[PDB]
A paper describes a structure:
The periplasmic chaperone SilF has been identified as part of an Ag(I) detoxification system in Gram-negative bacteria. Biophysical and biochemical analysis of proteins comprising the sil gene cluster has been limited to date, with sequence homology used to infer function and the proposed resistance mechanism, after comparison with the more extensively studied cus and cue systems. Such analysis is consistent with the model that the SilF is a periplasmic metal-binding chaperone capable of binding both Ag(I) and Cu(I) ions and shuttling them to the SilCBA complex to aid metal ion detoxification. The protein has a β-barrel topology composed of five β-stands arranged in the β1-β2-β3-β5-β4-β1, similar to that observed for Cu(I) chaperone CusF. The X-ray crystal structures show that the metal ion–binding site is formed from strictly conserved residues His63, Trp71, Met74, and Met76 located at one end of the β-barrel.
Cocrystallization of SilF38-120 with either Ag(I) or Cu(I) under anaerobic conditions yields an orthorhombic unit cell with three protein chains per asymmetric unit and each chain with one metal ion bound close to one end of the β-barrel. In both the Ag(I)- and Cu(I)-bound structures, the metal ion is coordinated with distorted tetrahedral geometry through the donor groups NE2 of His63 and the two thiol groups of Met74 and Met76. The Cu(I) coordination geometry within the binding site is noticeably different than that of Ag(I) where the fourth coordination position of the Cu(I) ion is occupied by a water molecule. The Trp71 is now blocked from directly interacting with the metal. Furthermore, the side-chain of Met74 adopts a different rotameric conformer compared to the apo and Ag(I) structures. Such flexibility allows the protein to provide ligands at shorter coordination distances so as to accommodate the smaller ion. By contrast, the conformations of Met76 and His63 remain unchanged between structures. Ag(I) has a dissociation constant (Kd) of 7.6 nM, whereas Cu(I) binds with a Kd of 30 nM: both determined free energies values were within experimental error of each other meaning that the affinity of SilF38-120 for either metal ion are very similar in size. The differing role of water in the two binding mechanisms allows an adaptability of the binding site to accommodate the two different cations with similar affinity.
Author numbering:
A (entry chain A): 11 to 89
B (entry chain D): 11 to 90
The structure:
């Protein structure tokens, strides 16, 4: 019942420092019937952006958590 | 974006054939930050109520899938 905090991983493919949005090509999440795909997340703390740029440069898989409210995706944490 | 279909397992602890609900003490689902706890699922099909009553008698872990709409949890499958 408490709000879902979804663990994911993927490659960061885009970032927008204006709209405070990040594009991740995420892996499948079979626990909730979700396939691998690419989507945008608005990051819930705006200071989260910095680390993501590193990943964006490197092209490395990263772990992250996020919330899914209807059609919106809010990025909560990233490594 | 496609609708979440959440897989779980647990023990059926109650059923209500009027409100069409089943109470399952489900295991943790770490993928979505959810702990083990007890909650109710609304069912649609009578073969789901049947299987659930079996499980209710036996006390067996069962697998199940469900959708989460606001406060409702709607059962999609259940399997002894
Ligand atoms: Cu990959
Ligand atoms: Cu997605
Ligand atoms: Cu158990
Ligand atoms: Cu629950």
């Amino acid at each position: 019942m408490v709000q879902q905090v979804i663990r994911g991983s993927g490659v960061v493919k885009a970032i927008d420092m204006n709209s405070k949005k990040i594009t991740i090509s995420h892996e499948a999440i079979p626990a909730v019937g979700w396939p691998a795909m690419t989507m945008r997340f608005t990051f819930v703390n705006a200071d989260d952006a910095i680390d993501a740029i590193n990943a964006l440069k490197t092209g490395n898989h990263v772990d992250f958590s996020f919330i899914q409210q209807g059609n919106i995706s809010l990025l909560k944490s990233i490594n």
